[PDB]
């Protein structure tokens, strides 16, 4: 299971996320929030995102600070063994990262998913 956010509407998918919000049904220019919080001593989780449109930025390798500048995850989380995965189901784009070990300091980042004029961003917070 993926501890992430799913914005796609395809009922058939080989991936299973912990939170799913259909972005096609929300109002235009409205923004959806999908917060993720990890607070365990040692992590062996896979956190990701399923977006039916485009992703800003190229997420999970470079992330959006919680207009704001784009930083890189490997320096924000400060651990050089973060693994990355991707997949494409038609127009849907799945981007995932697996994290193993502890983290020196509590950190947070954000990733935006935009389809047409609708836009919704998910935030991830990992406490040391």
């Amino acid at each position, epitope marked *: 299971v993926i501890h992430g956010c799913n914005f796609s509407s395809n009922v058939s998918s080989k991936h299973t996320f912990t939170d799913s919000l259909d972005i096609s049904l929300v109002d235009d220019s409205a923004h959806i929030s999908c917060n993720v919080h990890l607070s365990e001593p040692k992590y062996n989780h896979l956190v990701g995102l399923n977006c039916p449109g*485009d992703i800003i930025p190229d997420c999970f390798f*470079q992330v959006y600070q919680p207009p704001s500048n784009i930083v890189y995850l490997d320096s924000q989380i400060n651990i050089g063994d973060i693994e990355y995965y991707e997949d494409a189901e038609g127009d849907d784009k799945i981007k995932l990262f697996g994290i193993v070990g502890s983290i020196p300091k509590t950190t947070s980042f954000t990733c935006i998913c935009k389809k047409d*004029k609708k836009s919704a961003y998910m935030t991830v917070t990992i406490d040391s």
Partner: antibody
Amino acid sequence: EVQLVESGGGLLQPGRSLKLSCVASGFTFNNYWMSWIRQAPGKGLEWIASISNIGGTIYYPDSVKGRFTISRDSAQNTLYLQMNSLRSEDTATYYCTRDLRMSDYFDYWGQGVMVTVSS
Amino acid sequence: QFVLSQPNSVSTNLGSTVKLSCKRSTGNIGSNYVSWYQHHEGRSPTTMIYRDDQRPDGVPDRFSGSIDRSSNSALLTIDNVQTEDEAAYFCHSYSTGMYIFGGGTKLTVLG
């Protein structure tokens, strides 16, 4: 200021490959999507390829998929377009564009490189 | 996928108001952002309208973007047209994987 200096085209016989280069300046290179726009004599503007901030998302239309290949290099801050097996219908002017994804428009346009394919 | 239709050429006199349409084939034009670009003969294009109506710094206030939902089209309005406006105008819209452009409208100022 923002500048998109493009080069690497010219005249060549059909079948040969050609790699266009576009050096970008005046903005953080790995923070903005980029694209290539083609304009043929009398056919208007036509989008051909698009790459994301660091290549996380690649886009082509169903008309030049597999034959063209867009690329990006951060160490040189350069956007590349490899056009293999050039055909007569590929003769056109090519521009490289820095677009803003959150607004769906091309913010800055390149200089312009003519590519002529003829036997 | 959709197709953006534009008239080939329109002729307007100096000091008048011109409106350039941009009708969409399938889908509502209000769902996706519409952009307007000016392309001069022998020069690179410049952005005229980036969002549906917003124009960037450097474009004169006489240029305006609007969306006519009654006919499912996008209108580019130019008041007090000058001689420098004789160029091609292109209508653009993106729709998840494809960047659809318009046919192009050769604006000719009648001097």
